[PDB]
Paper text:
Here, we expand upon our previous results and show that biological specimens amassing <100 kDa can be resolved to better than 3 Å resolution using similar imaging approaches. The resulting reconstructions possess well-resolved density for bound cofactors, metal ligands, as well as ordered water molecules. We further demonstrate that conformational heterogeneity in specimens of this size range can be discerned. All specimens in this study were imaged using a base model (i.e., excluding imaging accessories such as a phase plate or energy filter) Talos Arctica TEM equipped with a K2 Summit DED operating in counting mode using the Leginon13 automated data collection software.
We first decided to target the 82 kDa homodimeric enzyme alcohol dehydrogenase (ADH), as the structure of this complex had been previously determined to near-atomic resolution (e.g., better than 1.3 Å resolution) by X-ray diffraction, providing an atomic model for validation of our results. Notably, as ADH is a nicotinamide adenine dinucleotide (NADH)-binding protein, part of our motivation for selecting this enzyme for structure determination was to test our ability to resolve the bound NADH cofactor, as this would serve as important proof-of-principle for the utility of SPA for structure-based drug design of similarly sized samples. We further purified commercially sourced horse liver ADH (Sigma Aldrich) to homogeneity and prepared grids of the frozen-hydrated specimen for cryo-EM data collection. However, the large disparity in orthogonal dimensions of ADH (~100 Å versus ~40 Å) posed a challenge during two-dimensional (2D) classification. Inspection of the map revealed side-chain density for most of the ADH polypeptide with pronounced backbone features for the entire macromolecule. Moreover, there is unambiguous density for the bound NADH cofactor, a catalytic zinc ion within the active site of each protomer, as well as a structural zinc ion coordinated by four cysteine residues. Furthermore, our ability to confidently identify bound ligands and cofactors within our ADH EM density effectively demonstrates the utility of conventional SPA methods for structure-based drug design and other small-molecule research involving similarly sized specimens.
Author numbering:
A (entry chain A), B (entry chain B): 1 to 374
The structure:
């Protein structure tokens, strides 16, 4: 195994929408200017990949999805100084350039050179690295980790502790940092406060873990699928409310149940109705609603601005407000100190060739996170 | 003059919408328990009164509007311990009871016993005091000051110092505290930041005064009426942009002028497309847009939630985040130290009987504030 050879490995190429991930053979180019090629170890299955295959994230197809992962650097670029081959890394959902306008600001992680505002499906030089049956396959958000080998940039890769169990640590890359960081850093949950969480996936259970870590008194988990409440109460949900039980709207349910509205509210579903709902179930004068789940594309809201004008605050968060190269090594380093229990997010551990199976476990609602070990 | 007699005095009663303020003879009942009856001195003309006569604030009419005022306590009710007859006070657009859930929160001024979320047009005993030709006339948000005498509550009145020129100090009651407080307290404008202000009335010029007072580098004033730019540059507007000059949409005008969007943005107009515009002209990762102007009633927005989801923050503010009985005496006390120059808001000083004239100066765009001295 040399450093500048093209690797024929296996990947899960998605060709067009509403079709299964075709696990096929791809050629992977060596690292060009300021790149890192990663032997991939464990890759989580996020709902954003289901947003790719369902069509609510418009990315240029054919694509290799996957952004929630950890791996080992196997070949290195020409001038990169952060990582060297052999050490465990996490591919970063949002890069940290260090030179841009956002990266020099005290708050703000959404770098200007990411791939989510205007998705090009490629790397920052303009050219892809995956070729499958002679045609190029697009990347996904600069990580594209549904393969045995991926190629990322230096600014979108994070060096983590060398003794990290990657099958669990791969959740720091997208899901847990989004939820936990959305609770403790974006919303800034104060002690004794009352929180509401809309959606109990890996992100929502991470929100409950963050609100419990910030010392919230009541944490209210709101979800249709009632089985997930049995998970939510073990990570901090003191109350659990199903919208399908109540013919009254759930705005007024969380209003009367939490004495006029919750203090902090979170929407991790990704639907517009629960965005407006999660805003309107806050307190009218000091409520903070954080949008976490991504909406379907080219679709707007219908929102009464008086809901904001009485005193609410309505934020958003990508990767939980965490500057990635700065916060991922200290979140894995804080996982070393057992600060958070990352085990209740993982429900299924499957090999890579069963990848569609994992997505069925994501689409039938029978799983929280399905880890793809390689 | 005694303390418990019904007083015939002149007022500007608005009977039904889209009609002039009929200045007629009203009777004012004496103040009941925990109420204050005020010799009114000077009453400013706000755009929210034009929102009453235009129909975008659904209140129960016939109503005596007007909330920007300063007066003298002339008779007192029982149980009132704060103010005593003879001292200058300011009626409060939003009360501060001190016992509610909002009034014990560190941030949040929107008290639960106000009259703006569910407007009843009366006081907390459910009973008005203005009778005109035998029929009762409704209050306006518990501070109905288009009359020579008025009756407010103890929770909705603020004792100011005895040496205050009320013809200028009456703008602390609604307008200036909304603008200045929206800049320095709700948005928390940091040192050297870049601000944008949509609308250059009394509230918008107060926003510019607050952003300059918090040390903003660039303050961009955006308004259709170009004459108002000649006022805005004397209170801090380093740049001034007209949307009517630019055939390109003003969102990417403010994005191109401020290199990716302004740091803080403010919408003090009170209309929906400028709210979505003022949100979208912030920075994608650390922008804060504050809604100030009240929208038309029961009309929603059409807003792309990705604008919030990249990292923006979208707030609102009634009375600029100021707890009223706590902040009005220290804002008049800070007017004593000449901390802010309140003269450039006042453009016209008219008597009360010319009140419709002042509203014409509000509706033709030829004035900033029209003070109604008695
Ligand atoms: N902002 C970010 O950076 C970021 C990062 C990761 C994921 N996400 C987004 O988070 C979203 C969900 O991710 P996930 O990990 O939580 O998986 P998930 O979709 O399985 O969890 C969402 C839950 O919402 C519930 N749901 C659907 N409709 C509902 C309704 N009316 N009321 C209540 N609940 C309802 C579902 O039961 C589901 O359990 C996705 O859209 C993903 O894109 C955002
Ligand atoms: N939140 C609060 O507590 C509070 C308090 C006082 C006033 N207000 C609201 O503030 C709003 C107006 O306040 P004001 O005192 O400045 O009155 P104003 O009418 O003098 O200011 C409005 C300005 O908006 C501008 N305008 C209209 N359309 C525009 C457009 N497309 N683009 C740019 N500018 C446009 C007008 O030129 C005007 O200068 C009102 O809705 C009023 O109710 C809110
Ligand atoms: Zn993910
Ligand atoms: Zn950056
Ligand atoms: Zn006003
Ligand atoms: Zn109160």
């Amino acid at each position: 195994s040399t450093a500048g050879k093209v690797i024929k490995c296996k990947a899960a190429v998605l060709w067009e929408e509403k079709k299964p991930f075709s696990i096929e053979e791809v050629e992977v180019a060596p690292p060009k200017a300021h790149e890192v090629r990663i032997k991939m170890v464990a890759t989580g299955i996020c709902r954003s990949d289901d947003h790719v295959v369902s069509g609510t994230l418009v990315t240029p197809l054919p694509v290799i999805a996957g952004h929630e992962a950890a791996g080992i650097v196997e070949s290195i670029g020409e001038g990169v100084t952060t990582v060297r081959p052999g050490d465990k890394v996490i591919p970063l959902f949002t890069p940290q350039c260090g030179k841009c306008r956002v990266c020099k600001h005290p708050e703000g992680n959404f770098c200007l050179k990411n791939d989510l505002s205007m998705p090009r499906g490629t790397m920052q030089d303009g050219t892809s690295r995956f070729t499958c049956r002679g045609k190029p396959i697009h990347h996904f958000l600069g990580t594209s980790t549904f393969s045995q080998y991926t190629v990322v940039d230096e600014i979108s890769v994070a060096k983590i502790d060398a003794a990290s169990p990657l099958e669990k640590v791969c959740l720091i890359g997208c899901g847990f940092s989004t939820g936990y960081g959305s609770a403790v850093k974006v919303a800034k949950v104060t002690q004794g406060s009352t929180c509401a969480v809309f959606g109990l996936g890996g992100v929502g259970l991470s929100v409950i873990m963050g609100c419990k870590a910030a010392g919230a008194a009541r944490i209210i988990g709101v979800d249709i699928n009632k089985d997930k409440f049995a998970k939510a109460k073990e990570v901090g949900a003191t109350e659990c409310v199903n919208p399908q039980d109540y013919k009254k709207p759930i705005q007024e349910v969380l209003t009367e149940m939490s004495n006029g509205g919750v203090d902090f509210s979170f929407e991790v579903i990704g639907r517009l109705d629960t965005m407006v709902t999660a805003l309107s179930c806050c307190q009218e004068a000091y409520g903070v609603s954080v949008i976490v789940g991504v909406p379907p594309d080219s679709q707007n809201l219908s929102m009464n601005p008086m809901l904001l004008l009485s005193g609410r605050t309505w934020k958003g968060a990508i990767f939980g407000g965490f500057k990635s190269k700065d916060s991922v090594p200290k979140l894995v380093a804080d996982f070393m100190a057992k600060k958070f229990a990352l085990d209740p997010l993982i429900t299924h551990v499957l090999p890579f060739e069963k990848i569609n199976e994992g997505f069925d476990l994501l689409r039938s609602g029978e799983s929280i996170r399905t880890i793809l070990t390689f």
